[PDB]
Structures are given as structure tokens and as C-alpha cells.
Design a protein around this nucleic acid. Structure first.
Ligand SMILES: [K+]
Ligand SMILES: [K+]
Ligand SMILES: [K+]
Ligand SMILES: [K+]
Ligand SMILES: [K+]
Ligand SMILES: [K+]
Ligand SMILES: [K+]
Ligand SMILES: [K+]
Ligand SMILES: [K+]
Ligand SMILES: [Mg+2]
Ligand SMILES: [Mg+2]
Ligand SMILES: [Mg+2]
Ligand SMILES: [Mg+2]
Ligand SMILES: [Mg+2]
Ligand SMILES: [Mg+2]
Ligand SMILES: [Mg+2]
Ligand SMILES: [Mg+2]
Ligand SMILES: [Mg+2]
Ligand SMILES: [Mg+2]
Ligand SMILES: [Mg+2]
Ligand SMILES: [Mg+2]
Ligand SMILES: [Mg+2]
Ligand SMILES: [Mg+2]
Ligand SMILES: [Mg+2]
Ligand SMILES: [Mg+2]
Ligand SMILES: [Mg+2]
Ligand SMILES: [Mg+2]
Ligand SMILES: [Mg+2]
Ligand SMILES: [Mg+2]
Ligand SMILES: [Mg+2]
Ligand SMILES: [Mg+2]
Ligand SMILES: [Mg+2]
Ligand SMILES: [Mg+2]
Ligand SMILES: [Mg+2]
Ligand SMILES: [Mg+2]
Ligand SMILES: [Mg+2]
Ligand SMILES: [Mg+2]
Ligand SMILES: [Mg+2]
Ligand SMILES: [Mg+2]
Ligand SMILES: [Mg+2]
Ligand SMILES: [Mg+2]
Ligand SMILES: [Mg+2]
Ligand SMILES: [Mg+2]
Ligand SMILES: [Mg+2]
Ligand SMILES: [Mg+2]
Ligand SMILES: [Mg+2]
Ligand SMILES: [Mg+2]
Ligand SMILES: [Mg+2]
Ligand SMILES: [Mg+2]
Ligand SMILES: [Mg+2]
Ligand SMILES: [Mg+2]
Ligand SMILES: [Mg+2]
Ligand SMILES: [Mg+2]
Ligand SMILES: [Mg+2]
Ligand SMILES: [Mg+2]
Ligand SMILES: [Mg+2]
Ligand SMILES: [Mg+2]
Ligand SMILES: [Mg+2]
Ligand SMILES: [Mg+2]
Ligand SMILES: [Mg+2]
Ligand SMILES: [Mg+2]
Ligand SMILES: [Mg+2]
Ligand SMILES: [Mg+2]
Ligand SMILES: [Mg+2]
Ligand SMILES: [Mg+2]
Ligand SMILES: [Mg+2]
Ligand SMILES: [Mg+2]
Ligand SMILES: [Mg+2]
Lengths: 64, 326
RNA sequence: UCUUACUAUAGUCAGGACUAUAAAGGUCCGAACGGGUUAUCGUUGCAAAGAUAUCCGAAGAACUAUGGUAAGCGAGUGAA
RNA sequence: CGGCCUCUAAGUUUAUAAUCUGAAGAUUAUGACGAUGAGAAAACUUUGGUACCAACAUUUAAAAGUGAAAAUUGUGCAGGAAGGAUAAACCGUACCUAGAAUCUGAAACAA
RNA sequence: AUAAGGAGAGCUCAUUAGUCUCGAACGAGUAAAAAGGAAGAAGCAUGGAAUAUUGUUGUACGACUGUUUAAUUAA
RNA sequence: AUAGAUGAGUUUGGUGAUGGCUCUGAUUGAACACU
RNA sequence: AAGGUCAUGGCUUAACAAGCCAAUAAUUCUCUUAGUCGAAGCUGAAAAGGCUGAUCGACCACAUUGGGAAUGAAAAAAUCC
RNA sequence: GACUAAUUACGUGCCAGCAGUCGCGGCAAUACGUAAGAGACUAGUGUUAAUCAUCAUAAAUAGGUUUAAAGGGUACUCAGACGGAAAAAUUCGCCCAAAUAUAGGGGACAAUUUUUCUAGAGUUUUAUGUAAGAAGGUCGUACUCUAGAGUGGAGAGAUAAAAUUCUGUGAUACCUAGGGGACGGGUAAAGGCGAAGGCAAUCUUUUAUGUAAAAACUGACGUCGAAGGACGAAGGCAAAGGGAACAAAAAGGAUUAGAUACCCCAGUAGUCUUUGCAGACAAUUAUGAAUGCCAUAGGUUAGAUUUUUAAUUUAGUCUAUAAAUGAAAGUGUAAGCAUUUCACCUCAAGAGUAAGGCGGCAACGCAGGAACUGAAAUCACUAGACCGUUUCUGACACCAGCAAU
RNA sequence: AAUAUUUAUGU
């Protein structure tokens, strides 16, 4: 979706601007829970480095 | 964040108003233009007293001219007789012309030439002129004398020069000629173009029209639908630099660089130098607007010689009649 | 050979400052240079347009040099 | 070390041809002439950005600095000549440069 | 807008990271350039002589830089 | 501290609501008027 | 690490580290108003009631306004400069 | 006078005056001014000002926001409030229980934390269905322009009727051949889709939720949400395009007592494309979102199951009811019983106005008083009356005829 | 079955 809102005329798609914001927020609620539950287990670090999920994706407030 | 010195908004360029003479300066953005010098052997200097508005007698025959920047004339090819592909090398800026010129190169021989660039024409484009006849491959591919639909699909491309008869109706052209073997004379200015209105043709019993007459009608930039020769040349597209007329010079000194000298009003003169001069204070003298030699400057007076009737006009221009447009 | 305009070929503009630029500005302060705001003097003057002070422009629509062109029935040139 | 000499600009032309024109003449082309520009070598000598030599800036004769010359690179638009090439004649050479005897201002003129 | 309005300035001197000099890392030096501080001295006075001619406010007119009656009107 | 919890007049042709105003209770470091 | 202290605390100092508080106003700023509190006074059936901040007691500030220091066990003055 | 215990007579006549509220006085006033009587308090009595209570009338105890003051345009979401099952550790919160209680006891509940569970919330299994959205292209019906030396040869169009207007430079009407713009007929329904705004021709490309059935998986990961940010109809500003049609404005013709207007001939911004600004709506279900729960019936939408004929069933939507609720109208998948959370309201009018401030190019938007003046504003219903309201019923009311003025 | 002139005032 982020790749589609950047293509030709992607800016005109102002209705799906909420869909991208709803996916990043739905993922923020799963990373915030998985962090305290997994207690930094090896299964939790494998997801971060593989998917490249930095703290900016769940720690603060995602403003889009 | 700080505002940049050069401010791009749309297709025009404006600058920081750090001086009163640069506040109203507006330029069209043409960054694809060649930044070097022109092809010297295709140019020659523009000097002499003619630059000041004088004729061979030495007296001013064109007022408000002189003192501009040194220039060189570019030998643009307005006929385009040589056939074969031509590779656009670069789009250059021509001071003695509103539109841009394109340095093309004949792949067959390698000779270079100048042509009025179209809107969107960039370096690398391959233009071709089918004015000297169609090449053997194109005729053989159809296998027949000509096909109007097939031809237009392989030759009606931007920058291609064709006889107006070969270009379909409704197409935009910008180098329209008049005579069968004459150069381009109409719509050569920046942003100008012409449309093909009608063609003197007839159906060939197979739905394929064939030219029957010797002329074709075209609507010019001024809105005049006149008659033009069947073999007259035309270039497909629109003249480049469409945002020319939106420019603003901003200061008086720029007009002086363009070889334009101050224009003194008639009211500012005395009763001996102009029909409008004289009177204490600002006064028009109850005299209808005229030129310094008595030519009506307003009201609809036409300066075209009466005896010189335009026998090529199908629909004359629309006269605004002095009514405000906006 | 003055002067106005144009034209060709050339030349000149200490230093400093601001501005987006190393260089993009009819930018700023100020010499040369170019102007001639105000006052005084002078008025058979040093001078048939000068002197002193003060003031304005000073990278520009700038200034300057050597040539060239356009003037006298109709008006040449003219930011008038 | 300039001129003379070669080349050409702006222009000029009772040169030639053609054309226009009450006469005088005018126009176009070519030629000739025309600097305020361009001209080999020497402390011995005889193609078009693969570009160009307008403005502005920068860099460059290796101890450093400074001022030129020429060139290098780049910037801005206002877009920036022409042509030719590549055993010592003739002419100029004295003085004056405007506060102290010389140029223009009627003059030995506070310009 | 260099708005306005203020501060500083010369001479002697403590002090010195580097550069430079000298002697033998270090030491010394301003008969090296600079930096430097709430230091100090003298006089009425240290932008010491000369050079750069006020500040602010309200209006009319013309946007502005420019141009004009050479030699009474520069607007 | 186990007796302590209350209403009334007024909107509408009229009814029922909503909602303010005023009255009924107690009081003042009070003032004024008649005493 | 050392001193200081009955003891504790950068309380103090040296040398390192770049933390600590806050994120919805921590912090700071301007304006309006006010002495604070108590079954102390008045009031309600009552509410961690409401109002007042007289006489009573406790606390704070002031002594024409502003700017300050010392003496003394202690400023806690209608003092003093 | 009534509230509020207590009466007559005379005088005055919307005058003079009374008045806390409603009010009284216009020639026979229990309301004003006298006289008398009566009711009541008393060295006090009234009035004015103020405070508490009245007032649940700023409602923590303890309110309310469909139609009466009051639900934000929207829901993603930081902070912050609230939120499962079965055990355990710590606090010793809570309770005995105080006196701001030393030290203890009790363990249901509460707080931080730990281990397990699957009913909440999610993920996978291409669902089906579907006008959410966006990109690049196209289709068609009509319209419009041009052309044919078209046929035809004097009318056409407009309106209640007309006029302005079009037409002999050949219109309207009937054709042929090209060009150009925006629009979206049927299907179509109480239908569906998105957070809302809103979304209806078509092909391809692209995009997040949601729904049904089965299993599987994670194992409370949830709901609400100030602000910030994002989205947000039409109209509008700005720039560049487009321009057939419609149409503010401006102008003309009618109508009319007058007619800016309603009607008509025409017509510019603008509607459309692209890029920004703007953020206000009867942005509505006049009803915030979410969770738990309560009895039936008849339709309808997309699925599932079945002896698929017809019956069960999940998630929506719409009518009519029960209990109940409501001022009533009505609602009854909620306007009921409860709960969570955010926003908002506190008599009318002044006023969503002023001033300062913030945002914007502007238009305007956000936020937001006080003074002066009032005792009323306001909602639903009831019965009438009225309607250039519908349908009936009587009348020389009308039509018709005769006679008359 | 898609018709459409004009109708102000009442201490
Ligand atoms: K200056
Ligand atoms: K002649
Ligand atoms: K001199
Ligand atoms: K002058
Ligand atoms: K709403
Ligand atoms: K315990
Ligand atoms: K588990
Ligand atoms: K209820
Ligand atoms: K106001
Ligand atoms: Mg769109
Ligand atoms: Mg002109
Ligand atoms: Mg002009
Ligand atoms: Mg003029
Ligand atoms: Mg004059
Ligand atoms: Mg005259
Ligand atoms: Mg006059
Ligand atoms: Mg200047
Ligand atoms: Mg004299
Ligand atoms: Mg100046
Ligand atoms: Mg020569
Ligand atoms: Mg020379
Ligand atoms: Mg002399
Ligand atoms: Mg002299
Ligand atoms: Mg002294
Ligand atoms: Mg001026
Ligand atoms: Mg000036
Ligand atoms: Mg003069
Ligand atoms: Mg003067
Ligand atoms: Mg009523
Ligand atoms: Mg006070
Ligand atoms: Mg007190
Ligand atoms: Mg009674
Ligand atoms: Mg009385
Ligand atoms: Mg009443
Ligand atoms: Mg009485
Ligand atoms: Mg007593
Ligand atoms: Mg809002
Ligand atoms: Mg609203
Ligand atoms: Mg316990
Ligand atoms: Mg399981
Ligand atoms: Mg589930
Ligand atoms: Mg599907
Ligand atoms: Mg005909
Ligand atoms: Mg016709
Ligand atoms: Mg189309
Ligand atoms: Mg809607
Ligand atoms: Mg449809
Ligand atoms: Mg849905
Ligand atoms: Mg939520
Ligand atoms: Mg918000
Ligand atoms: Mg809009
Ligand atoms: Mg718009
Ligand atoms: Mg526009
Ligand atoms: Mg109008
Ligand atoms: Mg009208
Ligand atoms: Mg219309
Ligand atoms: Mg926006
Ligand atoms: Mg909400
Ligand atoms: Mg149903
Ligand atoms: Mg529906
Ligand atoms: Mg119902
Ligand atoms: Mg109000
Ligand atoms: Mg305001
Ligand atoms: Mg508001
Ligand atoms: Mg009724
Ligand atoms: Mg009768
Ligand atoms: Mg009758
Ligand atoms: Mg009335």
C-alpha cells in the first residue's frame, strides 16, 4: 500500500490514507505486546532484524 | 527551513524580492536547454545600423529600437527537403525567436541543421521529413500507392514534416506553409499551432478518402480558416516555449537589453510633433486616437490594402470590436 | 571635429558591506569618474557659465576613446 | 617600435553589371577602398563544448606574496565580430602636456 | 535596519595551545606575527591630529533605479 | 445525636412537561425611616 | 576515590560517564482578585455541605514608599544605614 | 385582592398613586387616598443590602443532551480512564479500625508481577456478494460546431398568453461526412459498499476493512479517547488547461399598483482536468462510540446447513407489537434495563456579537465574554377554527331557460 | 394521465 500511494497519482488516493495508518497502528499494537511478552527472546530479535522493524514503528506515536 | 532564492511555482520562475526591479521578474522554466554555444557555421552576426531601426537611407524607419545585446542569427531550416531520419542533438535557445530550436543531425550524411523545436521534443528524438516523397520501404509495406490510415500511423509523429494532405483532420501543426514549394510561414511562434479543418477529397468506394482538389483548409493561430496548398509543408506538434507570453521583465533595463527603446506618448509631445500634442495640462484635445502620421489607432480601422483581397480565406477572423475580454 | 540618437571597434569603474551564489542584484557605504541639489562669491568675472563648500549616481537604462551614419520645401535627432 | 604593407568591421564608392527614375540620380549584387581591431618567427629570427575568446568568477610560470599576460574550469542570461591566414627601402623619432613661457577656451585665461 | 539607543578604542604589563626564532623532550625569547584580562600608569582630554554633516514623526505627489530645458525652472 | 429530609405564586385557548424568577425559613460587627 | 558529618545527602573536591525531571505544561510569563485557617461566626435535614475570614485562638506579612546590613544565644524591632 | 393571617364606607376615575411575584385604577375600586374595624409583632416594628436554605438551579453523594438549553463532521490513535477465566508472589491496599496508630490478624476484592486457560480481540484456509478508494484507457445516447455549391423554400422557437430573439448571408424540418466537450438510459430494490464526507456506463491494473461455514493458530494482545495529525459536501480563492451543456453576476423582454424577483430571449464567473489553499453544512438516525442483557411476528439483503420441494441458522437492514419506557409524540436490535468513555448544556434576550489572540492570499474559521433590558422564553399533546386543502352532503348556490334591474 | 395569468391590506 505504501508503494501504491507513491506511484503515479498515488497522492490522489486520499481514502486509503487511513488504510496505511490503520496497518501501521495495528502493527504497533502487536509489537508493543510482543515486546513485553517475549522478554527479548531470540524469537523476538529474529523478527526485527529480518523485517527491519525499528523502534520508531511501535515505541512512540505513529503520526501520518 | 528557509525559502530558496529561486522559487519554482508551476512552470514559471520567481526570485526573492530583494530589489524593487526583481520583484516582478518571471521566467519560464526551461532547464533542458543546451547551455553551450550554438553551432557557429550555422550562424552569422546581427550588426549594423539596422539594429537601431534604420534603413539604407540612415533614417529611423522603425522606432523604439537600438542599444540591445550583441546577437547572432541562426539559420533555421524552414523547408526541410532532405529526406531520411534526423537525430535531435540538443534543444537550444534562440535570442531572435520566441520558440526554441533543435540541432538535428542527418544520420545518412551527418550534416547538422536547425529546426523549430516542438513542445516536448527532447534530445535523442528522431524526426523525419516526408516532403520530398515517401521512401521505398514505406510504400512497399502497404504495397499500394498510398493508404491514409496506414501512412498517418507511421509518419504523423511529433516533429515530422509532411504535406498537409497526408496529415489527418484534427491534427495540430505548427510550421504550416502556403505555397507548394515554399517555406513554413504560419504558427512559427512560441506556443502557436494550427488545426486541419477540411481536405478537398472524395471517397474511393472503399471508405478510403482520396485527394480530389488542390488545397486544404486550416485554422490558424488567429482563428482564421484559410485555404492552403495540398503540397504545403507542416510539422506535427506545437511550437515549444508555450509559457513565453507569461514572462515578465520586471524592470526597464531588461527591455533595453532586448533592443527596445522608450516609447514616448503622443500626449507628451507638442502640437508640432504629434496630432495629440498641445494643451495646458493633461488634455487629449478631443482628437480621435491616431498615429504620428494620421493613421487611426483605434476603432477598427483596417490597415490591409483594400484592393489586396485575400482569395485564400474561407472564414475571416473574428473582430472583437473593442469589447473587453476579461 | 559641438550636441541628440544609432552604429562598429575598444577601454574604464580603489576598497569595503549585505544578499541564494566563488561568479545570478537597474543592491548598500564610499574614491577615481560622471552629475550639478543648496548657499555664498563673482557679474566691464580667472571664466560670453568660473571658484569654494555642500549634495547626488558610482556593475549600470553606466561612463569614456577613435571612426561611421542621419539635418534644413517635406523636418534630422529627441526617456519629449 | 609604430607607420607603410597583408586582412577585414561600421560604412563609403563619377568602378562594373542589372534594374528603377522629370534630369540630377537611387537601388541590388560584385569589386575596390576603408581601424577605433587582427597580422608568422627571435638574444638571436627571416573541426564548432572534439568549441569559443563577450561579461563575471575561479585556477595555473612551484620558496612565499603581489601585479599582468595567456590559458583552464565554471556560472548567469541579456546568449556574447569579420576576414586573411602562419641582407634588409621609404615615413615618424626635436621640444610643450598645462601652478609657471608651447595643446582647446578670441589670450601669457583660477576652465 | 548601519533603525533608534548603547559599549569599546591609545601607552605599559601579568598571562601563551599552536605557528616562528634561539639554545640544548625541555628551557628561553615579541630585537617575531598575534592572542589577552574586572591588571596598571600619566594627562583637562587616550574615535589622541586629518578624513565620513544630526536623529525622529505626520502628510501630499510620483511605485521604485533612471531621464529632461548644454548656459535662470531636476520637479 | 435515631428524626432529619416538606412546599407556594407565576408561561398556555386549555392539558401535561421543561425551565427560570419571586415568596415562605434562619440570620447580620448592618444602615435608613417611624418610634 | 578522598574529605566532611553522630549519621545521611555533590554536603564539598578531583577524575570519568551524559545523564536526571518532564512530555496531557514539568518550567516560565502576563493579567484580575485575595491576608490564611479553625463547629471561630452565620446557615442547611444532610453532603470531605455552603458563605464569611469581625470580636476568640494559631499562622503569615507590614509599620510613609522603595533599596540594604549588622549586633545578638536567637531578628523574632514601632530600632539602625 | 391572591400568594398570606385580617372589612366595610366615602373620595378619586388608566388621573393621583400602590406594587416582593401575578397585578390594581378607564364614574356603583374588598388592591389607590382618608375614616373605622379586623389580623399580627412589640421596645421594638417595617424597609433596603447581603449570606445560607428554597434550588437535584453546575447533581462527587446526585442531573441531563430524538422532537424542550446540550452529542463533536469522521474514527485511526500518544497521554489518560476502563476492561476476561483458574492459581500464585508481593503490597497489606481494603476490613477489624482507630487518634494522620506501634505491632498484628482476616483474603473475598484492589494494585505491580508470575504461571496457565480460551468465551473477548485477532491471524491462516484465493469465500460468496459488493456504486468504498485510485491509476491508465475506452464505449454509447443526445447535444454542439463545421462542411455538402445537400433535399426543401417561409417560417421557427419561446410562453398561461406574449415580447425580446433566430431566419432569405436559406433557418425550423429530413439526411450525409467529420470535429469537439462534459454527462451515464435501462437493470434498480424496504438493495448494497466505506470511519464519515460520500460512492451507480465500461475494460485492464491497483487498495484496507467487513460477512458465512469449518478446522487450525496466537493467548487478553481489548474498548473509549483531550490534543496533534489525517480525511472532510457544495460553493469559494490561486495557477495552468478545457469550454458542448447548464448557469450566480451584469444586461434586455414581460408580468405587476410597483417587481430587485417568480416566467422568457440570451449570458460571464463557476461546475469539468491538474496542483495547492480553505475546513464552515439540516456534515442527520435532529439520536457519539463501545460492551453485557430482554418477549414475539411479517418482509427483505449476503451466506451456511438440511429429507435443498421447504425448513433451521449466522451477520445486516426495515415495518408492526409484548413486557417496559417516555411530558407525550412515540421507541421497543432502544429514546428499555445496566456499564465504560469522550464531547457538550445550566432562564430568555444581548450573542456565537465585542475586544485581544491564533489560522488563512482572501473570503472567513477556531476560540469566546461583559454591560444594558426582561418574567417569562420553550417542548409535546387536546378540541375547535382556518387553508388560492382533499373528498362528500344540502340550498335558484350555480348551470340552463324565462322575466326583470 | 405532466396541466400552470393576476388575489396586497385589516389601532
Ligand atoms: K553611493
Ligand atoms: K534620374
Ligand atoms: K590644473
Ligand atoms: K545633462
Ligand atoms: K452527529
Ligand atoms: K496482612
Ligand atoms: K500459553
Ligand atoms: K427512560
Ligand atoms: K458586543
Ligand atoms: Mg478525481
Ligand atoms: Mg513600438
Ligand atoms: Mg509601453
Ligand atoms: Mg510612454
Ligand atoms: Mg510639454
Ligand atoms: Mg496637428
Ligand atoms: Mg485641465
Ligand atoms: Mg547601486
Ligand atoms: Mg559685485
Ligand atoms: Mg541611493
Ligand atoms: Mg583591403
Ligand atoms: Mg589600427
Ligand atoms: Mg592658450
Ligand atoms: Mg591655465
Ligand atoms: Mg587624573
Ligand atoms: Mg519619481
Ligand atoms: Mg532618482
Ligand atoms: Mg538650465
Ligand atoms: Mg539648476
Ligand atoms: Mg398554542
Ligand atoms: Mg487586598
Ligand atoms: Mg484577621
Ligand atoms: Mg386570606
Ligand atoms: Mg399601602
Ligand atoms: Mg399572567
Ligand atoms: Mg387602600
Ligand atoms: Mg429586649
Ligand atoms: Mg469541528
Ligand atoms: Mg456542527
Ligand atoms: Mg491483604
Ligand atoms: Mg487450542
Ligand atoms: Mg474469535
Ligand atoms: Mg470476492
Ligand atoms: Mg440549393
Ligand atoms: Mg443549410
Ligand atoms: Mg469523447
Ligand atoms: Mg449521507
Ligand atoms: Mg442507471
Ligand atoms: Mg459495511
Ligand atoms: Mg478505537
Ligand atoms: Mg482530536
Ligand atoms: Mg471543493
Ligand atoms: Mg473549485
Ligand atoms: Mg481560473
Ligand atoms: Mg440581475
Ligand atoms: Mg428583469
Ligand atoms: Mg441558457
Ligand atoms: Mg487540507
Ligand atoms: Mg467519538
Ligand atoms: Mg430480519
Ligand atoms: Mg441498506
Ligand atoms: Mg418500529
Ligand atoms: Mg444565550
Ligand atoms: Mg473577533
Ligand atoms: Mg465556536
Ligand atoms: Mg388538530
Ligand atoms: Mg338568487
Ligand atoms: Mg342564467
Ligand atoms: Mg393585525
Amino acid at each position: 500500500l505504501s508503494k501504491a500511494l507513491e506511484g503515479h497519482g498515488g497522492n490522489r488516493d486520499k481514502n486509503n490514507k487511513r488504510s496505511l495508518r490503520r496497518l501501521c497502528h495495528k502493527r504497533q499494537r502487536l509489537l508493543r505486546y510482543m515486546e513485553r511478552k517475549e522478554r527479548g527472546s531470540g524469537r523476538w530479535h529474529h523478527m526485527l532484524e529480518t523485517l527491519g522493524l525499528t523502534p520508531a514503528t511501535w515505541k512512540g506515536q505513529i503520526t501520518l | 527551513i528557509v525559502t530558496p532564492y529561486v522559487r519554482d511555482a508551476g512552470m514559471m520562475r520567481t526570485y526573492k524580492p530583494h530589489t524593487p526591479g526583481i520583484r516582478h521578474l518571471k521566467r519560464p522554466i526551461n532547464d533542458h536547454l543546451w547551455k553551450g554555444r550554438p553551432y557557429l557555421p550555422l550562424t552569422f552576426p546581427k550588426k549594423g545600423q539596422s539594429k537601431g531601426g534604420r534603413n539604407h537611407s540612415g533614417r529611423v524607419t522603425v522606432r523604439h529600437r537600438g542599444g540591445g545585446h550583441k546577437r547572432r542569427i541562426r539559420m533555421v531550416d524552414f523547408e526541410r527537403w532532405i529526406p531520411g531520419p534526423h537525430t535531435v542533438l540538443r534543444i537550444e535557445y534562440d535570442p531572435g525567436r520566441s520558440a526554441h530550436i533543435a540541432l538535428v543531425k542527418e544520420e545518412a550524411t551527418g550534416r547538422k541543421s536547425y529546426i523549430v523545436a516542438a513542445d516536448g521534443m527532447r534530445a535523442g528524438d528522431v524526426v523525419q521529413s516526408y516532403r520530398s516523397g515517401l521512401p521505398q520501404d514505406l510504400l512497399d509495406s502497404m504495397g499500394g500507392v498510398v493508404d491514409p490510415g496506414i501512412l498517418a500511423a507511421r509518419t504523423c509523429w511529433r516533429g515530422n514534416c509532411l504535406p498537409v494532405s497526408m496529415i489527418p483532420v484534427g491534427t495540430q501543426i505548427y510550421c504550416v506553409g502556403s505555397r507548394p514549394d515554399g517555406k513554413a510561414v504560419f504558427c512559427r511562434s512560441a506556443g502557436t499551432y494550427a488545426t486541419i479543418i477540411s481536405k478537398e477529397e472524395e471517397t474511393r468506394e472503399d471508405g478510403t478518402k482520396v485527394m480530389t482538389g488542390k488545397f486544404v483548409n486550416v485554422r490558424l493561430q488567429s482563428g482564421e480558416i484559410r485555404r492552403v496548398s495540398k503540397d504545403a509543408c507542416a510539422t506535427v506538434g506545437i511550437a515549444s516555449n508555450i509559457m513565453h507570453h507569461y514572462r515578465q521583465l520586471g524592470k526597464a533595463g531588461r527591455s533595453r537589453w532586448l533592443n527596445i527603446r522608450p516609447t514616448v506618448r503622443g500626449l507628451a509631445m507638442n502640437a508640432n510633433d504629434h496630432p495629440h500634442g498641445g494643451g495646458r495640462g493633461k488634455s487629449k484635445g478631443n482628437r480621435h486616437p491616431v498615429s504620428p502620421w494620421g493613421t487611426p489607432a483605434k476603432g477598427g480601422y483596417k490597415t490591409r490594402r483594400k484592393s489586396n483581397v485575400n482569395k485564400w480565406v474561407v472564414t475571416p477572423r473574428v473582430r472583437n470590436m473593442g469589447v473587453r475580454r476579461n
